[PDB]
Every structure is written in structure tokens, then in C-alpha cells.
């Protein structure tokens, strides 16, 4: 009944949530690493490492892991975000320990063969080249670069081609040594899982993990708070049929008291697609404007990214490079934020947003995997897990006024960074946006 928690002598946290009537589960190891724990020449390591952990360990050869997992019908996966590195598995309950075993094995005792470390550099480039075809991904990488100017958060996860061709097996081993400390990781499980037994296996297969010499509780401040830098980066590209713009303002962080209120304001502005509509029975004035007299854009989407110590909140626009005056659409978006700031929003649309928000945060925690994803991320970046029940309370209590204050604090006399890719010729700059927004 709830999320059970236990700590190991080396700091490792074991966070569990039992699910009645289940015979399978998901277990994952979450580390407070990621690319924000790299430096300029380092950039790209954590991800590289991740690819390599699947190439073989001091106990199991690459193809030995594969065949072992497939014979019991489990699944192994991993990703790297700016804030963390995650390795996790899905398997029947009988195999829970066997999975915790392999997870620790791959995460720490990995071979990192130099031969592998070389064939990989090409796979990582191919990977990189695909991301460059996903404009939204591109536009957002740049936004992070100029918004977190010369800071950890500002660098991308994949890293520069440069570093991908120059990462040395020593870089890897160092990132491991430097970052992989017990007090910096959470082992999360949900499904058919006995909390106590999982705490045991945790000791047995993760006990051997180095403790930090200067341990800090999972939630406490990294060091110097990232700082939001107003800026703009226009990327002319006359060949693109569509132009992609992103406009952001310093947002909110995971543990912030106004976290949900920010997500609530995001929901109130919402999204829109020139073809599909808003996916709401009643479109906002912005949504209506966007579509009138020919369309002012192809689509727009509100976004709100969070980190433990910072946040980005804004709009992502997509225009036809040959048909739209980007300035026209930006005005309506600014006009909509001003509307929120001025209080002219109804009880009805606030409720719709709270409802949209509630469903998005809770009804979506269905599988053991989706649930582990929540336990894991919440604890490894915050130091606790707000239960579904608690999250429901946090959203349900938000008020029209709460939103209006939040809007006035964050969208009035505050810096804005921006990025445009494509037919840059019609995009207004940052001082224009700030003038109209603050106007």
C-alpha cells in the first residue's frame, strides 16, 4: 500500500511499489549522472558508455547477456538524459533477482573493450545523423545551448561529432569512477515485487558500490544553480519547407512549490495543429486565431521542461517557410500569455486544464514499467515519490488565481531565449518578444 523505501549502507536507495494481481515486474537502476555531469571535452561520454554496457562484462560476454535475457523472456533497456543514466529490465517475478544481478553487472563490471569502443564510434555518428533529421530535437538542443550558455545543462546528450571520434576508454572508466556512487543512485521496482527481498539482492549486487566521500541526500543542490541566459540563435536554412521556432522563459524545477501550477498554465494555453485542431471540444482564442484567414502556422505546442535545479517553459512553433509570417503567430501567442496574466480566463477552462493535467499525470501510470519510471525519476532527482494520491491533491487544489500569479511572476519582466531554424527572415528577435510580452 504505497511506495516502500530503504537505504543501503553505501547510500543506494531501494524504492518499491507492489502491484496486486501481477506476475511480472520492472526493476531499474537510476543514476544521478547524465550529460550534465560531463565537461566540454568530455561531452558525449555517458551516452557512449550506455551503448558499451551492452557489449560485455567481467562475467558475461555480449551475446551471453542477450541469450540469457531472451531465454527467460525478459527485456533490457537503457537511455541517457541530461540528468540521469538509466538501465532497467522487465521480467517475470521468478526472474527479479536474476535481473537485478545483470543490471548491476552491466552497469559496473563492464569490459569496455577497445575494439568495441571503436566500432561504436560509427554507430553513435549514424545515431547523431538521425537526430539531425528531427528538427524539434535539433531546435531544442540549440535552445539549451544558448539558454544555459557554457553550462552543463547547455550541452547535448549525444555530444559533438568531435568528442564521439575522440572519446578514450579512459574517459569512460573515469566517468564511471567519478559518478557511480551509491548515494547517487536509486534502484526502483514495481509489480510483483517483495520490497524486503529486493533490498537484499540490492546489497548483494550493488553493495560493492563506492560511496561518495562527500555524500549529499538525493534531493539537495548540486552546487551553483544553473542560470538562465537570454539569447537568440537564428539558423538560416532556405531549403527547409517548414520553419521551427522555440521561445522559452526560465521555468520551474521538479521540487518547486509551483511545479504543477506551471504545468497547469501550460495546459491552459495548450497545443494546436492546423489539420487536427486542438483535441479539445472548445478552442482557445489563440487556437482560433491561429487557424483563421489562411492559418498563421502549421502547429504550435506548449512545453515545460524540468530539472532538479532549473526549468524551461514556453512555446514551440512550426510554420510553412513559404506561407507564414512568423511574427503574426508569435503575436497571438504573446497575446494569449498576456490574457492569462490579465486574469481574463474562465473557471471552466481552468478546470479543463486541471482535468487534462490530472489524467496526464495519473491515468498514464498504468504498467509496472510506467510506474517504475515514476518512482525512479522522482526519487533520483528529488529524493522522494509523491504518491498518485498526493499528486492528485496537488493538482486539484490549484486555483484560477494561483495560475494568474504564476503567469505574472514568470511572464512579466523576465528574460527570454529563442531559437529559429529554417526561413529565419520573418522571425522577430528576443527584445521584440520581451517588449510585446512585458508591454
Amino acid at each position: 500500500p504505497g511506495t516502500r523505501t530503504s537505504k543501503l549502507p553505501n547510500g543506494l536507495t531501494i524504492a518499491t511499489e507492489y502491484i496486486p494481481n501481477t506476475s511480472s515486474a520492472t526493476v531499474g537502476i537510476f543514476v544521478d549522472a547524465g550529460s550534465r555531469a560531463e565537461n566540454v571535452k568530455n561531452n558525449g561520454t555517458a551516452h557512449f558508455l550506455q551503448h558499451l554496457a551492452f557489449k560485455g562484462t567481467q562475467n558475461r560476454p555480449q551475446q551471453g547477456i542477450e541469450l540469457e535475457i531472451e531465454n527467460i523472456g525478459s527485456h533490457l533497456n537503457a537511455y541517457t538524459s541530461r540528468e540521469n543514466t538509466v538501465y532497467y529490465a522487465k521480467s517475470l517475478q521468478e526472474d527479479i533477482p536474476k535481473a537485478v544481478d545483470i543490471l548491476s553487472d552491466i552497469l559496473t563490471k563492464s569490459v569496455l573493450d577497445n575494439s568495441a569502443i571503436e566500432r561504436e564510434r560509427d554507430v553513435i555518428i549514424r545515431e547523431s545523423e538521425e537526430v539531425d533529421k528531427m528538427y524539434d530535437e535539433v531546435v531544442f538542443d540549440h535552445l539549451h545551448e544558448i539558454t544555459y550558455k557554457d553550462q552543463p545543462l547547455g550541452r547535448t546528450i549525444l555530444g559533438p561529432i568531435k568528442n564521439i571520434k575522440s572519446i578514450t576508454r579512459t574517459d569512460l572508466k573515469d566517468y564511471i569512477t567519478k559518478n557511480y556512487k551509491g548515494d547517487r543512485m536509486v534502484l526502483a521496482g514495481a509489480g510483483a515485487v517483495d520490497h524486503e527481498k529486493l533490498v537484499q539482492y540490492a546489497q548483494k549486487y550493488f553493495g560493492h558500490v563506492p560511496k561518495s566521500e562527500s555524500p549529499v541526500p538525493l534531493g539537495s543542490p548540486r552546487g551553483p544553480l544553473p542560470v538562465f541566459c537570454r539569447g537568440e540563435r537564428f539558423i538560416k536554412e532556405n531549403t527547409l519547407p517548414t520553419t521551427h521556432i522555440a521561445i522559452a522563459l526560465e521555468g520551474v524545477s521538479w521540487s518547486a512549490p509551483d511545479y504543477f501550477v506551471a504545468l497547469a498554465t501550460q495546459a491552459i494555453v495548450g497545443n494546436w495543429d492546423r489539420a487536427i485542431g486542438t483535441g479539445t471540444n472548445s478552442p482557445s482564442p489563440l487556437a482560433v486565431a491561429a487557424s483563421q484567414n489562411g492559418s498563421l502556422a502549421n502547429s504550435y505546442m506548449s512545453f515545460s521542461t524540468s530539472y532538479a535545479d532549473s526549468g524551461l517553459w514556453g512555446m514551440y512553433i512550426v510554420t510553412d517557410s513559404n506561407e507564414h509570417n512568423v511574427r503574426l503567430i508569435v503575436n497571438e501567442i504573446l497575446k494569449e500569455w498576456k490574457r492569462i496574466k490579465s486574469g481574463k480566463i474562465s473557471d471552466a477552462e481552468v478546470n479543463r486544464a486541471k482535468a487534462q493535467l490530472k489524467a496526464a499525470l495519473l491515468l498514464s501510470l498504468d504498467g509496472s514499467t510506467a510506474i517504475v519510471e515514476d518512482i525512479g525519476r522522482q526519487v533520483v532527482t528529488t529524493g522522494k515519490r509523491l504518491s498518485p494520491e498526493e499528486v492528485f491533491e496537488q493538482v486539484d487544489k490549484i486555483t484560477k488565481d494561483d495560475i494568474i500569479m504564476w503567469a505574472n511572476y514568470r511572464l512579466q519582466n523576465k528574460p527570454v531565449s529563442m531559437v529559429a531554424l529554417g526561413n529565419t527572415s520573418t522571425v522577430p528577435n528576443v527584445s521584440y518578444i520581451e517588449e510585446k510580452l512585458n508591454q
Binding site: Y79, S81, F140, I157, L263, T305, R377
Partner: peptide
Amino acid sequence: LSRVAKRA
């Protein structure tokens, strides 16, 4: 609700 940029 906006996703968390991840790379696999």
C-alpha cells in the same frame, strides 16, 4: 505534459 529528452 512534456516528455524528458532521452537518447537510447
